[PDB]
């Protein structure tokens with residue numbers, strides 16, 4: 001049940017809501033008021049999802065799919081079988097997510113650490129809200145949201161993309177991808193760096209950070225440092241997801257045409273717009 | 282508000298650190314560079330020194346040759362006009378030889394030869410730099426994690442412009458050097474193989490990419506959350522568990538039911554990132570050599 | 584076919600890999616225990632990994648994990664219920680006792696050394712050639728606690744030489760003794776240094792270091808521990 005050093009940490013307090021009421025654990029897990037909140041939202045949501053599955057007449061997970069209301073319903077409510085169920089399910093997800101974040105906050109307090117983790121998570125939550133709330137509202141129907149199904153959701157991605165041409169040309173999409181790639185690069189390195197120091201060549205002593213610091217200065221002539229690479233990681237990650245939201249929130253709202261075409265602005269600057277030759281002249 | 286430790290609130294400086302010496306050839310290391318106070322607000326302010334050596338120079342020279350060989354081509358396309366060059370910079374493209382020449386090294390220069398030169402340059406550039414990551418580690422007596430991690434990346438690149446073009450029978454199947462052109466090639470590569478979303482490696486690869494962000498978000502915010510107990514000093518924490526390591530592990534145990542150790546978390550890390558291009562490489566390799574259309578394959582599973 | 588082969592293969596690879604990953608993270612704090620310290624009955628599907636031994640630099644010996652676990656300090660906590668899973672209430676002063684968000688681990692009473700074998704962290708006065716290169720130099724600024732009362736004055740900065748980093752502020756109290764304050768728990772302002780976790784009256788309780796030019800892993804933990812705990816335990820004294 002407890003890690004060899006856990007007991008002295010399991011003291012009362014830190015709860016945001018409800019005092020000592022839910023201030024307790026269940027196996028390794030911490031409950032807290034929000035422990036309960038998330039459970040309830042999670043229970044409800046899964047139920048509704050199964051209920052959608054009978055109306056659909058399949059129990060096969062590769063097939064199950066809960067779709068939003070069709071565009072004709074705009075931002076109004078829709079019949080269960082006709083889009084209501086997704087709308088509730090979406091409400092329930094949100095409930096789950098936010099609650100899961102606030103529990104993280106409550107654990108943070110009991111342990112006496114910073115709130116960076118709940119913090120970073122809120123970016124994930126905000127990306128999800130962008131795709132099922134902010135964008136549809138702004139566009140004008142729940143129908144612009146993505147459906148909850150394993151492959152159907154990949155389909156929405158593909159269809160929504162190809163609507164504006166090759167989506168690769170969405171400029172904030174370019175930026176968002178550069179982080180995803182960069183972050184992975186940096187997670188690759190960081191991990192590798194620490195391990196190689198902690199697990200040197202056979203029979204050698206544990207290397208020191210100075211060795212680590214040295215390894216990189218030798219390699220690419222610069223070492224960002226241990227508080228650094230951790231600040232870096234948090235940032236690349238949060239940024240990747242920040243730009244991911246951005247590229248979507250603008251798509252279909254303030255730009256509805258082909259993304260490639262938006263680049264004509266550059267190429268049509270009057271100082272070289274008419275100069276012959278090249279690719280565009 | 283409380284301090285967050287995303288940016289330093291006081292910079293401090295001392296004599297330029299020339300680093301550990303162990304078995305490193307000190308005749309090769311450079312001189313210390315300046316110090317960016319800019320950088321200093323985020324991480325270390327000290328630039329340099331850097332280790333040259335034979336492999337560094339070869340790598341660094343081939344590296345520039347590659348880049349320049351592409352550069353002259355772009356200018357030749359731009360009508361040597363600096364205005365066009367700027368206007369059309371992302372439209373220019375150095376394309377592989379036509380399918381006609383196959384795996385031939387005899388394609389005319391304007392028709393694909395120049396692409397081979399550039400690639401040859403990149404090949405040597407990249408491999409030498411790989412050997413560089415390895416040696417730099419050896420000379421400090423360190424594990425070779427970094428070189429092996431690097432090898433994963435190299436895998437996907439090897440497969441894209443070398444192994445797959447060769448197994449298909451022609452260089453024309455490789456990736457063109459160009460900003461918009463390599464985007465198009467990618468988009469088109471999926472169309473031709475029946476939508477890469479049905480390539481289960483592609484799907485796996487995305488999971489590990491998404492995951493890398495998830496994890497580096499988790500790890501980073503955690504270490505910052507406990508740097509108030511010297512969390513970032515991970516090597517000593519491994520060697521002698523501090524409350525930092527404890528609060529870290531527990532926050533996570535109490536949230537989701539299990540947890541890492543300080544050495545442990547970094548194994549999760551190196552593997553989550555390395556699996557991105559590992560799986561990736563495989564998904565692409567089978568694409569068009571063994572499987573012509575992932576949707577059809579998806580219907581049968583063979 | 585081949586593809587089918589490859590993917591089935593991979594899902595198998597991946598499964599033994601997780602298994603590996605998982606057992607490696609079982610190197611500390613395992614095996615599990617009951618609230619009374621007796622070994623717990625259900626330790627999960629995963630076995631303990633086979634031990635690994637780390638050779639610590641500068642002749643500080645070896646470390647073998649997993650290995651015999653022991654807190655090596657008293658815990659002043661008492662159960663608040665008759666069944667498992669409820670909090671344990673401090674039986675004294677959690678701060679003074681070092682439980683809760685004020686917990687510290689019995690690390691070594693030896694300072695962390697740099698790659699060369701010298702003390703990693705030093706008061707700047709004794710760090711030849713180190714100066715505040717940017718930002719507000721705290722040194723000389725009064726220190727304010729969450730109760731908005733002055734508690735002392737910064738009389739130095741303890742720097743991390745290998746990372747050229749400010750780790751702690753040393754503070755001079757009204758009785759002429761000094762304490763270290765983690766850099767990460769104070770806001771350096773233009774005319775003062777503000778500490779939100781501790782009220783002026785608790786600065787004296789901050790554990791002291793035995794030698795004036797060195798800190799040990801044990802003392803770092805006892806200090807960081809203490810200051811962090813203020814956040815939950817000083818709470819009645821904090822106003823804003």
Ligand code: BCL
Pocket residue numbers: 046128131146150151153154157478483484485487488489491492495
């Ligand atoms: C954000 C970008 C796009 C999108 C584009 C893609 C693309 C492109 C791909 C996926 C893939 C996946 N997507 Mg998606 N996906 C989106 C939004 C979502 C949402 C959401 C609520 O917002 C979720 C939960 C998922 C979940 C998933 C997984 C089924 C799968 C692997 C992801 C992964 O490894 O992440 C990293 C996270 C982890 C490793 C942590 C653990 C995650 C586990 C696997 C979560 C599974 C949840 C799932 C089974 C449903 C549970 C819900 C109920 C409680 C039952 N996507 C939006 C619309 N998604 C890949 C796939 O192969 O699936 C077809 C793929 O190729």
Ligand code: BCL
Pocket residue numbers: 157181184403407434435437438441466467468469470471476477478480482483486487490557558560561562564565
């Ligand atoms: C229309 C587009 C198609 C498609 C076609 C492809 C194709 C084609 C490929 C990918 C690939 C990938 N796709 Mg896909 N993909 C689509 C939609 C998506 C979506 C989505 C819809 O949300 C996502 C999230 C992804 C995500 C991804 C990545 C997981 C994956 C590449 C990982 C990587 O980091 O390589 C980045 C890393 C590298 C390329 C390694 C290179 C390392 C070298 C050595 C670097 C050298 C630098 C050089 C020498 C210059 C030096 C630098 C200078 C000094 C500055 N795809 C659709 C279906 N996708 C790749 C893959 O693996 O697929 C299975 C791939 O080949």
Ligand SMILES: CC[C@H]1c2cc3[nH]c4c(c3C)C(=O)[C@H](C(=O)OC)c4c3nc(cc4[nH]c(cc(n2)[C@@H]1C)c(C(C)=O)c4C)[C@@H](C)[C@@H]3CCC(=O)OC/C=C(\C)CCC[C@@H](C)CCC[C@H](C)CCCC(C)C
Pocket residue numbers: 181182184185188189192219220340341343344345348406407410411414427428430431432433434554555556557558
């Ligand atoms: C495991 C997967 C991820 C990964 C890992 C990875 N990559 C790695 C490593 C590892 C573990 C290394 O050790 C190695 C490295 O040394 O990094 C520091 C590398 C590396 N990955 C790199 C790039 C890279 N990795 C990528 C991807 C990934 N790498 C994956 C996501 C990508 C993409 C496309 O996503 C890129 C672009 C290099 C930084 C470095 C390998 C360097 C190399 O091989 O150099 C060879 C040649 C040269 C010396 C060329 C230099 C020519 C330049 C001077 C021209 C450009 C001039 C330009 C205009 C300059 C200005 C830039 C401004 C920003 C200031």
Ligand SMILES: CC[C@H]1c2cc3[nH]c4c(c3C)C(=O)[C@H](C(=O)OC)c4c3nc(cc4[nH]c(cc(n2)[C@@H]1C)c(C(C)=O)c4C)[C@@H](C)[C@@H]3CCC(=O)OC/C=C(\C)CCC[C@H](C)CCC[C@H](C)CCCC(C)C
Pocket residue numbers: 038041042045046089092093096097100104117118120121123124147148149150151153237238241491492494495496498499502536537
């Ligand atoms: C912001 C950067 C990245 C990030 C960070 C991040 N994620 C995080 C955190 C952080 C910092 C956490 O602390 C938290 C965590 O605890 O991790 C272990 C979390 C987490 N990120 C998760 C998943 C996740 N994160 C993702 C993405 C990312 N997370 C980013 C790329 C993704 C994808 C698709 O990329 C996924 C799948 C969880 C493992 C975990 C949060 C767990 C959680 O919220 O539990 C509460 C909810 C439930 C128990 C289930 C609720 C059931 C619903 C009511 C119904 C189901 C509806 C759903 C909409 C159906 C979708 C079906 C699909 C097929 C489309």
Ligand SMILES: COC(C)(C)C(=O)C/C=C(\C)CC/C=C(\C)CC/C=C(\C)CCCC/C(C)=C/CC[C@H](C)CC/C=C(\C)CCC=C(C)C
Pocket residue numbers: 348349351352353355356397400401403404438439440441442443456457458459460463
């Ligand atoms: C300012 O102007 C001057 C001229 C000074 C410049 O220098 C400007 C230069 C620029 C304009 C340069 C611009 C360069 C880019 C736009 C480059 C973009 C490159 C990419 C987007 C590349 C993407 C993908 C590349 C891939 C996957 C390459 C793979 C290569 C290989 C695996 C190598 C394979 C080897 C070959 C085929 C030959 C092997 C032969 C043997 C004998 C072994």
Ligand SMILES: CCCCCCCCCCCC[N+](C)(C)[O-]
Pocket residue numbers: 075076077087088090091094133
């Ligand atoms: C966090 C809330 C998320 C809700 C997601 C969608 C709910 C749609 C609410 C509309 C209900 C009725 N209406 C049209 C009268 O407003």
Ligand SMILES: CCCCCCCCCCCC[N+](C)(C)[O-]
Pocket residue numbers: 481482484485488492552553601
């Ligand atoms: C590092 C361990 C975590 C790995 C995450 C494994 C779950 C990913 C599930 C992806 C679903 C994939 N597939 C093959 C059907 O496309």
Ligand SMILES: CCCCCCCCCCCC[N+](C)(C)[O-]
Pocket residue numbers: 026027028537538539
């Ligand atoms: C993917 C999530 C995995 C979480 C693993 C959690 C381990 C819990 C150990 C069993 C505890 C049991 N319980 C709840 C019945 O008391």
Ligand SMILES: CCCCCCCCCCCC[N+](C)(C)[O-]
Pocket residue numbers: 538539540601605626627628629
């Ligand atoms: C895709 C990520 C999945 C994470 C893998 C799940 C590992 C669960 C380990 C549970 C450990 C149980 N224990 C011993 C803590 O009780």
Ligand SMILES: [Fe+3]
Pocket residue numbers: 190194230500504515547
């Ligand atoms: Fe780390």
